C-alpha cells in the first residue's frame, strides 16, 4: 500500500510520495506539496 493515512485534530490527511504516484493529478488548492530539506525539492503530496 502506497498511502500513509492519519487524522489529526479535525483534518484527514493522506500522504502519497512522488515515488509511488505513477499518476498525474491536478495540484488542487487542497493538496500540500511536501518538500525535502536535503534536496530542496518536492517529494510527496498530502491530500487534506
Amino acid at each position: 500500500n502506497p498511502n500513509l493515512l492519519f487524522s489529526m485534530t479535525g483534518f484527514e490527511v493522506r500522504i502519497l510520495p512522488k515515488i509511488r504516484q505513477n499518476e498525474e493529478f491536478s495540484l488542487k488548492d487542497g493538496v500540500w506539496n511536501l518538500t525535502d530539506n536535503r534536496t530542496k525539492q518536492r517529494t510527496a503530496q498530502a491530500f487534506i
Binding site: K28, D29, N33, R42
Partner: protein, 204 residues
Amino acid sequence: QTNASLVNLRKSIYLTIMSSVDFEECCHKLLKIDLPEGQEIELCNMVIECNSQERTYAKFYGLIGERFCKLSRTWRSTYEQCFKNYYETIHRYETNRLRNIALFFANLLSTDSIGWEVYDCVRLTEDDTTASSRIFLKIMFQEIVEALGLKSLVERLHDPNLVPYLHGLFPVDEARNVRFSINYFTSIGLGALTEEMREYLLTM
C-alpha cells in the same frame, strides 16, 4: 461605447472568479461568459490582475491559467502574449503584486503549459533590466526549481532545439554581459546551469 462594455465585462469576470470555489468550476463559469471575438486578451489579463491583487499566491489562479491554455491553442498564445506584455510593464507593480505575477507565470511554465518560447523577450543587461525585472526572474526561477528540481531544469534550458534560444538569459557572447549573467545566476542560487558559459570568458 466600448468603455462601458469593457467595464461591464471586467465586473462580470471578477464576480465570476470571486463566486467560485475550485478552479474547475471557475473555468466552467468563465467559458459561459460571452466575450468579443478579439477580446480574449481581456479575460487572461484580468485573471492575472485578480491573482496579483490578493495577499498571498493561491494555486487557484495558476490552475485556472493552465486549464485555459490546456483547453485550446488560442489561450496558450494569449498567455504567451500576456507574459510578454507583463515583462516590460513589471516595474509599475509593488513587490507583492510582482511576486504574485511571478508565481503565476512560474506555475504556468513548470507544467509545460505555455512552452519556454517566452524567454526570448528576456535580456539580462543593465541597459534593459531593472531591479523589478531581476526580482521577477529570481522568484520565477526559484519557484521553477522547487517545482522541477534543478535536475530537469538543466536539460530543459541546455537543450532548446526550438525557437527559444535564451539569447538574453545566456547572452550572445558580447561585451560585459556574460559576467553579469553568470554572477546574477549564481547570486540567485541556480549556479549549476551557468558553468557551461563560465568557460567562454576563458575562451574570450
